[PDB]
C-alpha cells in the first residue's frame, strides 16, 4: 500500500526488482487487490470498459485524420485501380537521401507509407468522397471519445455509482442490448445506406444540408405504408453500371440480386441494405423475449431449470447454472471470448470469398493482410476463452451448488474426453505425416506416379450442391430438376450461380488432393490445441500427481522436485503450451491461403496443384521462391522500397530467436551470475559511490515463461507480416 503496488502489500514489501515486474503484471486483476469488495470490483470494471471505448474511438479518429491530412484519398477515388493509397507520412531524421527518394510513392511530395488496411475502399463504399468528410468524421470521433471519458468519470461518482444488483440484471440488460445495440444500430445503418451511400454510388451527393429534401426513392414511403414493398426493387443497377457515376444506374434501393457488381467485383449495395434491414427486424423482435418490469416475457432461470431430460442421462440437467453464470465473471468472459473468436474466424472466412467493399479483391496485398490479421486475432481470442474458463474452474466453481448438473458431469468423465481427444490427435498426426513423408520419398526417387493422392470428394460434393458444375456430380443446385433449384431460380440463383461458376474469383475455389491434406493438417492442429486447453481446464482443480491444486491458484511455478518432479504443472502452463500450438495452426492456415491465392493471382494454379502434395514442394516453391524480392530489399548495390520489410523480416527472425533464451535456460544459472555481478559492483572504485535501491534478482519462473512466449510471439508475427506484405507487394499479382 505504501510503495508502488498500492493494491498489494506483499509486493510492496518486496525488497527486490521483482516488485516492479509483478506490480506491472498484476495491476489489472482486480479480484486479487487488497480489501476488494464486489461492488468496487463491478464499478471499476465498468469505468475501465468506458476507458477502452474511448481508446478505440480515438484510434479510429486518428486514422481518419492522418488519412485526410497526408493521404491521396481523392486522387485514389478518381482512379481506384491505378493509385496506391497512402497511410501516413514519414519524418525519420535517421534516413539518408536514397531512402527519401525510394519512399516517395503515390502522388506525394515526400516519403509516405502505403496503406494495407483497406480503409480507403471501406470509406469510399459508404459515401465518403473528399477530405472534408474525413475531417468531419475525425472531429466527431474526438467528441465521442470525450463523451465516453466524461461518462466514465461521472458513473464513478458517489451520486451516480450503480449498485451490485444493477449489474446482475441479466434479463433487462439482454433485452436492451439485443434490441437497441443490435437491431436499432443495424436499422440506423440501413438508413444511412439508403439515404446517403446508395445515391453516392449513382452520382448523387447527399449531405446534412440536403438530407431533408433528397428523396431516397421517387415515391418515398408511399408504397411502404401502402403494403407495396416490391416497388422499392423495380429498377436495380445495370450490369454496365460504373460505380460513382450515373451511367446505367437504377432507382431501386432494396434489391435481392445476389452475386457481385461486375465493375467492382463486390456485393451489391442494395443487397446489403435489405440484409441489414432484415437483421434489424429480427433483432428488434428477438429483444422482446425476457421478463422485465411489465409482467410479460420468459425467465431465464426457469428455462434452465425446466430443461432437464427424464431418465437421468444428463443427471440433474441445467439446474443451478443460472447462479453459477450470473455470479461468475470468468464464466461470462469465457463465453464472450469463445463467441467472439468464432465470429472473427467467420469474418475472415466470409470476407475473402464475398468481398463487400468496392475495388477490394483487386488489391491483393490488402486482402491477404486482412485475412491474416483477423485470423490471428481469432486464434488468440480462442486461447483466451479457454484460459479464462480454467480460471473459472479454479476460482468461482462451487461443487455443492452444481451437484450432478451438466457442469459437474463434465468433470465426471474428463478422463474419457482427454483419452478420445488424444486418440484423435494421434490418429491424424501419424497418418497425415505418413502420407506427406511417403509422397516426399516417391518424388525423391523420381517416381511421382506412386504417391497417394486422395480426392476430397466430400467437399467437392458440397461444392456441387452449391451449384458448381465442374465436378459433374449434378446434385441439388447443380441439378435443374431439383426442388431447390426450381424454388430459387428467380430470386437469388442467377447471380449466385454466375458468381460461383466463375473461376477467376475466390468464391468456392477448386480443390484437389493438396487441399485435402492441408485441411487434414488443420484438423490435427485444432484437435491438438483443444486437447491441451481442455486438459488444462479440466485438470485445473487437481490431479493424481497433485490433488490439491485449487489451493495454489491459477498460476504457480511448480510443486518442487518431489514425487518425481512437477514442472509446468498448473493450468497457466497448459495455456502457455497451447499458445505454441495455436501459433503453429494459424501459421499452417495462413500459409495455405497465401500460397493458393498467389498461384491463383499469377494464373499458374498448376504449380500449387502439383507441388502442394509433398513438403519439399512447399519449402521450395512457396518460401524460397517468394523470398527473393524480400531478401533483396537492400544489398551492396543500393536499396528499394522493400528495405523496411527486409529489415522487419530480419528483426522478426532475431526476436523469435531471442525468445528461445528465456524458453530453454532457467533461473538458477542467472541468479548465481547476478550474485557474482553484485559482488563485482560493490568492490569497484568510483562505482561504489552509486548504490541500487532494489536488490537485483533474476526473473521468476512464470515471468520467464511469459517473457519467452512474448518475444516468441512478437517474432512470429513480425516475420510473417513482413514476408506476406513484401512477397505480395513486390509483384501485386
Amino acid at each position: 500500500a505504501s510503495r508502488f503496488p498500492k493494491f498489494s502489500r506483499g509486493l510492496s514489501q518486496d525488497p527486490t526488482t521483482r516488485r516492479i515486474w509483478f506490480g506491472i503484471a498484476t495491476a489489472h486483476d482486480f479480484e486479487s487487490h487488497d480489501d476488494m469488495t464486489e461492488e468496487r470490483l463491478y464499478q471499476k470494471i465498468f469505468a475501465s470498459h468506458f476507458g477502452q471505448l474511448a481508446i478505440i474511438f480515438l484510434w479510429t479518429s486518428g486514422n481518419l485524420f492522418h488519412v485526410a491530412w497526408q493521404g491521396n484519398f481523392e486522387a485514389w477515388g478518381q482512379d481506384p485501380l491505378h493509385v496506391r493509397p497512402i497511410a501516413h507520412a514519414i519524418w525519420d531524421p535517421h534516413f539518408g537521401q536514397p531512402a527519401v527518394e525510394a519512399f516517395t510513392r503515390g502522388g506525394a511530395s515526400g516519403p509516405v507509407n502505403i496503406a494495407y488496411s483497406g480503409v480507403y475502399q471501406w470509406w469510399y463504399t459508404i459515401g465518403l468522397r473528399t477530405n472534408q468528410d474525413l475531417y468531419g468524421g475525425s472531429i466527431f470521433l474526438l467528441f465521442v471519445s470525450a463523451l465516453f471519458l466524461i461518462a466514465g468519470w461521472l458513473h464513478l461518482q458517489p451520486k451516480w455509482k450503480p449498485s451490485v444488483s444493477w449489474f446482475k440484471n441479466a434479463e433487462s440488460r439482454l433485452n436492451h442490448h439485443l434490441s437497441g445495440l443490435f437491431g436499432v444500430s443495424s436499422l440506423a445503418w440501413t438508413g444511412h445506406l439508403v439515404h446517403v451511400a446508395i445515391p453516392e454510388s449513382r452520382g448523387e451527393h447527399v449531405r446534412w444540408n440536403n438530407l431533408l429534401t433528397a428523396l431516397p426513392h421517387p415515391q418515398g414511403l408511399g408504397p411502404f405504408f401502402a403494403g407495396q414493398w416490391n416497388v422499392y426493387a423495380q429498377n436495380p443497377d445495370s450490369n454496365s453500371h460504373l460505380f460513382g457515376t450515373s451511367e446505367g444506374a437504377g432507382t431501386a434501393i432494396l434489391t435481392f440480386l445476389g452475386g457481385f457488381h461486375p465493375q467492382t467485383q463486390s456485393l451489391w449495395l442494395t443487397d446489403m441494405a435489405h440484409h441489414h434491414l432484415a437483421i434489424a427486424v429480427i433483432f428488434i423482435i428477438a429483444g422482446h423475449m425476457y421478463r422485465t418490469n411489465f409482467g410479460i416475457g420468459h425467465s431465464m432461470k426457469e428455462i434452465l431449470e425446466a430443461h432437464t431430460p427424464p431418465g437421468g442421462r444428463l443427471g440433474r440437467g441445467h439446474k443451478g447454472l443460472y447462479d453459477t453464470i450470473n455470479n461468475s465473471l470468468h464464466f461470462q468472459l469465457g463465453l464472450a471470448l469463445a463467441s467472439l473468436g468464432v465470429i472473427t474466424s467467420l469474418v475472415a472466412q466470409h470476407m475473402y470469398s464475398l468481398p463487400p467493399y468496392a475495388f477490394l479483391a483487386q488489391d491483393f496485398t490488402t486482402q491477404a493482410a486482412l485475412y491474416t490479421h483477423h485470423q490471428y486475432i481469432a486464434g488468440f481470442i480462442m486461447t483466451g476463452a479457454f484460459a479464462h474458463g480454467a480460471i473459472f474452474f479454479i476460482r468461482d466453481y462451487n461443487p455443492e451448488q452444481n451437484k450432478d448438473n451438466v457442469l459437474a458431469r463434465m468433470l465426471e468423465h474428463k478422463e474419457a474426453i482427454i483419452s478420445h481427444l488424444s486418440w484423435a490427435s494421434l490418429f491424424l498426426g501419424f497418418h497425415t505425416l505418413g502420407l506427406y513423408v511417403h509422397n516426399d520419398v516417391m518424388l525423391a526417387f523420381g517416381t511421382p506416379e506412386k504417391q497417394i493422392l486422395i480426392e476430397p470428394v466430400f467437399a467437392q460434393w458440397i461444392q456441387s450442391a452449391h451449384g458448381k458444375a465442374l465436378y459433374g456430380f449434378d446434385v441439388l443446385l447443380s441439378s435443374a430438376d431439383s426442388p431447390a433449384f426450381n424454388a430459387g431460380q428467380t430470386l437469388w440463383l442467377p447471380g449466385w450461380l454466375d458468381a460461383i461458376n466463375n473461376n477467376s474469383n475466390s468464391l468456392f475455389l477448386t480443390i484437389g488432393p493438396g487441399d485435402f491434406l492441408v485441411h487434414h493438417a488443420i484438423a490435427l492442429g485444432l484437435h491438438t490445441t483443444t486437447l491441451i486447453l481442455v486438459k488444462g481446464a479440466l485438470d485445473a482443480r487437481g490431479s493424481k500427481l497433485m490433488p490439491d491444486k485449487k489451493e495454489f491458484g491459477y498460476s504457480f511455478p511448480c510443486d518442487g522436485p518431489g514425487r518425481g518432479g512437477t514442472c509446468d504443472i498448473s493450468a497457466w502452463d497448459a495455456f502457455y503450451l497451447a499458445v505454441f500450438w495455436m501459433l503453429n495452426t494459424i501459421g499452417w492456415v495462413t500459409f495455405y491461403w497465401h500460397w493458393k491465392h498467389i498461384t491463383l493471382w499469377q494464373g499458374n494454379v498448376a504449380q500449387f496443384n502439383e507441388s502442394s502434395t509433398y513438403l519439399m514442394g512447399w519449402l521450395r516453391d512457396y518460401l524460397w521462391l517468394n523470398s527473393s524480392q524480400l531478401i533483396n530489399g537492400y544489398n551492396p548495390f543500393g536499396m528499394n522500397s522493400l528495405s523496411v520489410w527486409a529489415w522487419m523480416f530480419l528483426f522478426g527472425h532475431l526476436v523469435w530467436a531471442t525468445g528461445f533464451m528465456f524458453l530453454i535456460s532457467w533461473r538458477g544459472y542467472w541468479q548465481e551470475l547476478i550474485e557474482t555481478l553484485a559482488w563485482a559492483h560493490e568492490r569497484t572504485p568510483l562505482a561504489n559511490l552509486v548504490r541500487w535501491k532494489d536488490k537485483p534478482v533474476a526473473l521468476s519462473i512464470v515471468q520467464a515463461r511469459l517473457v519467452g512466449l512474448a518475444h516468441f510471439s512478437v517474432g512470429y508475427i513480425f516475420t510473417y507480416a513482413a514476408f506476406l506484405i513484401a512477397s505480395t507487394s513486390g509483384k501485386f499479382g
Partner: protein
C-alpha cells in the same frame, strides 16, 4: 513469508525436520500416532520454500504442506 502447515495424518518419523535447511520445523509431543509426536513449524519466517520437507514425507499425500507467499530478503535467499 511462506506458510507451512502440518496435518493430522503425520506419523512422527521426523524426516521433514532433518531435511529442513533453515531449521523451521521441530518435533512436539502429541497423541494420535504410535510415535506419540508430531511436527510443528514455529519459525516460518525463515522458510525459503525449498520443499525438501515435502519430498521427505512418507504419506499417501503429504502431511506437511508449504504454501508460497510474500517474498522477503530471507525468503529470497539473498547473501547481499
Amino acid at each position: 513469508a511462506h506458510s507451512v502447515k502440518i496435518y493430522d495424518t503425520c506419523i512422527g518419523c521426523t524426516q521433514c525436520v532433518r531435511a529442513c535447511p533453515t531449521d523451521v520445523l521441530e518435533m512436539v509431543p502429541w497423541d494420535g500416532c504410535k510415535a506419540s509426536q508430531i511436527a510443528s513449524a514455529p519459525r516460518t519466517e525463515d522458510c525459503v520454500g525449498c520443499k525438501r520437507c515435502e519430498s521427505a514425507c512418507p504419506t499417501d499425500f503429504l502431511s506437511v504442506r508449504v504454501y508460497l507467499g510474500a517474498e522477503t530478503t530471507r525468503s529470497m535467499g539473498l547473501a547481499y
